[PDB]
């Protein structure tokens, strides 16, 4: 019931709903998992190849942690919070300092390692996108967004941001970030998650985008036949040849397998599904968990799939049980995500 | 602010294989009363009111 897939449980899970997960880069030996929660904390575990998990370190914001990411050398963890700030967390010394400030919660945070610069990107509900050298108190760069930031992704030289009211913007990152293309959104309801994918030559080439309406869009930046190469598919809906109305759930997270180019989605229905967007097929759907799956991600080589079982407020405050127990599950889904043939 | 209005999943229609089918949107921000905010925005509002 709580772990229907019989996957590996992370020991000492966060005390409140898990909002974000992020695995260590390949510059770092081993695998380290970061998670931020709605109890305002950030946690770090070492995942051992045996599957066994060791809680390593912890930090605190003063409001819920909405996103986390790593520096490219694996030495820093960056954290974004509803307290309107972002911190840089040096694991070796376990110290964290403020590196960013917004006028509203900071929904997204990303590390940009470019040939001629490095910075932190923060996207906020104050309708700005800001960039930080982690040294100065002034942002290196401030861009206005068309609405509140809801999700973002970065793979140099591409970034993609989605905002409230179907805003969707692609940025290029060479030399200095700049707006590259304002996209008429292929989805008609609230944007929720976004993930960049790469072509067969490893260059970022498009993104997948999830909404609250059981739907995911596949969007190539520059395909030969956009009518035909871009598409949307339905997911995280109830099923059986029943005639009851279909229940539609929010898509909460998307992540691409770093080796296979396939993708996973996790939903408000307490299920994860694996997909091949080239074959346009569903490779797997999980058993249903007893609460929503709130976040997910892969480790650097894709051998570990991490997903978080947490309430996501999709039915409002009346359905929050301040605890039912929260979970992070690890599953070795490498062969389950391998394309077929 | 917050989620004081009771959750009621809005109804709509969609397609399946082609036949129109009835749907229930199981996400509170699908109601007209909650559509201008995100799940996370609403949760922060409930947290700041101690409405947990």
């Amino acid at each position: 019931n709580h772990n229907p897939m019989k996957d590996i449980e992370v020991t000492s899970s966060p005390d409140d709903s898990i909002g974000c997960l992020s695995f260590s880069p390949p510059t770092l030996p081993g695998n380290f998992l970061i998670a931020g929660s709605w109890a305002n904390d950030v946690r770090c575990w070492e995942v051992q190849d045996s599957g066994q998990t060791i809680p390593k370190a912890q930090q605190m914001h003063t409001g819920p942690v909405l996103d986390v990411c790593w520096s490219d050398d694996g030495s820093k963890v960056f954290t974004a919070s509803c307290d309107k700030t972002a911190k840089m967390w040096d694991l070796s010394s376990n110290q964290a300092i403020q590196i960013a400030q917004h006028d509203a919660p900071v929904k997204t945070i990303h590390w940009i390692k470019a040939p001629n610069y490095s910075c932190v990107m923060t996207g906020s509900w104050d309708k700005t996108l800001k960039f930080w050298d982690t040294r100065s108190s002034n942002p290196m760069m401030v861009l206005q967004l068309p609405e509140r930031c809801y999700c973002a992704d970065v793979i140099y030289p591409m970034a993609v941001v989605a905002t409230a009211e179907r805003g969707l913007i692609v940025y290029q990152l060479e030399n200095q970030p700049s707006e590259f293309r304002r996209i008429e959104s292929p989805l008609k309801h609230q944007h929720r998650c976004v993930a960049i994918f790469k072509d067969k030559q490893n260059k970022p080439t498009g993104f997948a985008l999830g909404s609250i309406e059981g739907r995911v869009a596949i969007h190539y930046i520059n395909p030969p036949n956009p009518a035909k190469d871009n598409f949307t598919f339905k997911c995280h809906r109830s099923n059986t040849n029943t005639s009851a109305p279909q229940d539609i759930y929010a898509v909460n997270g998307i992540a691409f397998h770093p080796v296979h180019g396939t993708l996973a989605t996790v939903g408000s229905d307490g299920r994860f599904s694996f997909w091949d967007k080239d074959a346009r097929t569903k490779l797997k759907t999980s058993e249903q968990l007893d609460q929503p799956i709130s976040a997910c991600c892969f480790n650097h080589n894709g051998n570990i799939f991490a997903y978080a079982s947490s309430y996501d407020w999709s039915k409002g405050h009346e359905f929050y049980n301040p605890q039912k127990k929260n979970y992070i599950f690890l599953r070795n889904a490498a062969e389950e995500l391998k394309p077929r043939n | 602010t917050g989620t004081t209005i009771k959750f009621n999943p809005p109804t709509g229609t969609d397609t399946m294989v082609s036949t129109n089918i009835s749907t229930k949107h199981q996400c509170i921000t699908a109601m007209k009363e909650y559509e201008s905010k995100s799940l996370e925005e609403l949760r922060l509002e409930d947290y700041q009111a101690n409405r947990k």
Partner: peptide
């Protein structure tokens, strides 16, 4: 380690 049946996505139109 067995594999589920690969189903086609439910595309739109």
């Amino acid at each position: 380690s067995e594999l589920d049946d690969e189903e086609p996505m439910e595309l739109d139109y």
